[PDB]
Amino acid sequence: DLSASVPTRPAEPERKTLADYGGYPSALDAVKQKNDAAVAAYLENAGDSAMAENVRNEWLKSLGARRQWTLFAQEYAKLEPAGRAQEVECYADSSRNDYTRAAELVKNTGKLPSGCTKLLEQAAASGLLDGNDAWRRVRGLLAGRQTTDARNLAAALGSPFDGGTQGSREYALLNVIGKEARKSPNAAALLSEMESGLSLEQRSFAWGVLGHYQSQNLNVPAALDYYGKVADRRQLTDDQIEWYARAALRARRWDELASVISHMPEKLQKSPTWLYWLARSRAATGNTQEAEKLYKQAAATGRNFYAVLAGEELGRKIDTRNNVPDAGKNSVRRMAEDGAVKRALVLFQNSQSAGDAKMRRQAQAEWRFATRGFDEDKLLTAAQTAFDHGFYDMAVNSAERTDRKLNYTLRYISPFKDTVIRHAQNVNVDPAWVYGLIRQESRFVIGAQSRVGAQGLMQVMPATAREIAGKIGMDAAQLYTADGNIRMGTWYMADTKRRLQNNEVLATAGYNAGPGRARRWQADTPLEGAVYAETIPFSETRDYVKKVMANAAYYAALFGAPHIPLKQRMGIVPAR
C-alpha cells in the first residue's frame, strides 16, 4: 500500500493567493530599488509561500551586499533552511566569521555568487583555505575570464597580481591560458618554451587548458598529446578532466581512460557517466568482475541514460511496470486541500483562465516549495493530484523525485496522443522518440517559451518555424498552437534526420544545435552512438541527447513497441 498520510498546512482563500501574487513582481522590484520599507510591507502579511520565500531570499542577498546585518539576521531566521539560497547562507556564515563552507566551496573553479565569492576571500585572508585548492581556483577563474575575482582571491592569499610573486606569475600565464590565447596555433609552443620556469601546478593546469580546448574542438590526437603532459591531473578543473576522459573515450584508449577517471574527484567518479565508462574500460581490458561491479553501481543511479546502458550490459532490459499501487483517490483529493499545494493549484488554474505565463511560472515555484521534503508516498500522491488538474510538468516533477517507488506512468506521461501519434506517423518517425523529445523540451507545457524564444511543446525556434512554414505550406504563427507546433516539430525531426545521413542520434543533436553543428561533431570514421553523445562539445546539447534517447527507451516500453535496447537505439553514428 501507499500511505494515505498527507500534509494539512493552513490554507488561504483563492482571493488571498491572487492578491499576494498581484504584489509579487512589485516586491521583487522593491528589492532591486533598495526600498526596504516596501519589501517589509509585502512580507508582513504574506502567506508561507514560495512568493514570500523568493522575495525574502532576494532581499537578503541585497541586505548582505549592503551590510545591513541586523535586518539580515532577523529575516534570515524566517526562512525554512531547505529554502535558504546558497548566497544567503554564505552571507550569513560570513557575518558570523564562520568559514566552515569554504573547504568545499573553494573546489569550485568558476563564477560563484558575490556572497560566496566574498566568503572565500575572507577565508583566504585569515589563512583558512587550503593553498593547493585556493590557487587552483585562481587559475580556474583566470581561464574562465573572471579576472577580477581571480585578482581579488590572489590578493587575499597574500600574493597579488601586481606583487612580483606567485600571483604575478599566475596572471602572466594568460598568454597561454587566456580564452583566445589558448586557441592560438603557437600556444603549445609558447607553453613548451616557458615550461621550465613554471611550478608543477602551473604546468599541469596550463597543459590542461590547452588539452581542454583541443578536446572540445574534437582535435582528438592533439588533445591527448597535450593532456599527456599534465603531470598532476588533480590540478585540472572538473571540465578539463572530463574533457580528458572524453578524448580518451573517443580514441578508444581504454587504459588511459581508466587512469584519468581514477584521478577525478570522487563525486565525478561516482557519476553515472564515469561509472559506466569505467565499467566499459574494465570490460575492454578483460577485468570482467570489476566491470560487473561498476555496471551494478551505475544501474542503481536511477532512470537515466547510463543507468539504462549499464543495466543492458548486465542483461537487464527496461521494465516500465509500476512497483507501487496507484494512490488512493481520497488521498489525491486531500492532498489538494493542503495549504501549500492548494496555493500552487490556484495560481496554476488562474494562469490558464487568465492566459498569464508569469503566473504559471510562479505556480511551478509554489509546487516545488509545497512538495519539498515530501516522502515518496506523498510525492506519488501529489504527482497524481497535479496530473488530474492538468499541471503536467509538475506531475513529472514529483514522480521523478522518488528513488525506490516507481510510477512510470507519472514519470513518463503521454498526453496529446490524438495529435502526436498521427503527426509522427505522417513523417515516418518513431513516436517514442517524439514523446521522449517533448518530455525533455517542454515537460508537456503547451505554452512553454525558453529564454531564447523556443516555443511550445516541441520548443521550435521562431526562425526555424519561418523556414518550416515556407516549405510545408503553413503560416509561421501556427507555431503557437499545439497542433501546428507538433506538425512543425515532427516535420523538423524528420527533415533534420534526412540531412544527417538519416541517423537518429545526429538528428537529435541537430534538432537542438542545428545540423551544421551535429555534422561538425562527427569523426572521419564511425563513432559508437553513446561515444558521439558523450563527446558533444556543447554541454546543453550533450545532456539533451542523452535525456531524449533515455526518455525514448522508456516511452517505447510503455507503448508496447517491439523491443529496442537503448544501445541499439544509439547504434553507430556514421563517418563524415
- Rounded to whole angstroms, the Cα distance separating 271 from 238 reads 12
- Is residue 533 within 8 A of residue 505, CB to CB? The reply is yes
Helix (H) or strand (E) holding 527: strand 527-528
Tell me the C-alpha to C-alpha distance, in Å, between residue 40 and each of 60, 73, 81, 374.
11, 14, 20, 30
- Is residue 411 within 8 A of residue 402, CB to CB? The reply is no
- Rounded to whole angstroms, the Cα distance separating 478 from 485 reads 7
Residue 38: name the closest of 66, 114, 46 by CA: 46
- Is residue 247 within 8 A of residue 224, CB to CB? The reply is yes
- Rounded to whole angstroms, the Cα distance separating 202 from 132 reads 11
Say which DSSP state 317 is in.
Answer: P
- Rounded to whole angstroms, the Cα distance separating 23 from 340 reads 18
Helix, strand, coil fractions of the chain, as percent rounded to 5: 65, 0, 30
**Cell numbers at 507, concatenated:** 538528428
Contact residues for 316 (Cβ-Cβ < 8 A; gap 6+)? 299
Residue 563: name the closest of 553, 576, 573 by CA: 553
Class of CATH domain 334-404? mainly alpha
Place of cell 553514428: 573
Place of cell 516596501: 38
Burial 317-342 (b: 16+ CB within 10 A, else e): ebebeeeeeebeeebbebbbebbbbb
Contact residues for 380 (Cβ-Cβ < 8 A; gap 6+)? 2, 324, 327, 398, 399, 402, 405, 407, 410
Cβ neighbours of 78 (radius 10 Å): 13
Rounded to 5°, the CA angle 274-280-285 comes to 125
Q: Which long-range contacts link 275-281 to residues 24+ away (Cβ below 8 Å)? A: 275/301, 275/306, 275/310, 276/306, 276/309, 276/310, 277/245, 277/249, 277/534, 279/310, 279/313, 280/254, 280/313, 281/254, 281/255, 281/257
- Rounded to whole angstroms, the Cα distance separating 479 from 415 reads 19
Contact residues for 193 (Cβ-Cβ < 8 A; gap 6+)? none
| CA atoms within a 13 Å half-sphere pointing along the CA-CB vector of 474 | 22
**Cell numbers at 542, concatenated:** 550533450
Residue 113: name the closest of 160, 78, 155, 62 by CA: 62
- Rounded to whole angstroms, the Cα distance separating 545 from 249 reads 17
- Dmax (CA) for the chain in angstroms is 74
Contact residues for 554 (Cβ-Cβ < 8 A; gap 6+)? 303, 318, 320, 408, 411, 412, 436
End-to-end CA distance of the chain: 54
Tell me the C-alpha to C-alpha distance, in Å, between residue 576 and each of 58, 224, 491.
50, 22, 24
- Rounded to whole angstroms, the Cα distance separating 121 from 557 reads 52
Reported structure resolution in angstroms: 1.4
- Is residue 359 within 8 A of residue 351, CB to CB? The reply is yes
One-letter identity of residue 203: R
Tell me the C-alpha to C-alpha distance, in Å, between residue 339 and each of 18, 49, 71, 358.
14, 9, 28, 21
Tell me the C-alpha to C-alpha distance, in Å, between residue 85 and each of 55, 58, 81, 90.
11, 9, 9, 9
- Rounded to whole angstroms, the Cα distance separating 275 from 500 reads 31
Contact residues for 463 (Cβ-Cβ < 8 A; gap 6+)? none
One-letter identity of residue 391: F
Phi then psi for residue 224, to 5 deg, are -70, -35
- Rounded to whole angstroms, the Cα distance separating 36 from 546 reads 45
Tell me the C-alpha to C-alpha distance, in Å, between residue 348 and each of 16, 18, 411.
15, 11, 20
- Is residue 290 within 8 A of residue 282, CB to CB? The reply is yes
Rounded to 5°, the CA angle 265-266-270 comes to 125
In the chain, domain spans: 334-404, 417-573
Fold of 417-573: Lysozyme (1.10.530)
- Which method was used? X-ray
3-state secondary structure 257-313: HHHHHHCCCHHHHCCHHHHHHHHHHHHHCCCHHHHHHHHHHHHCCCCCHHHHHHHHH
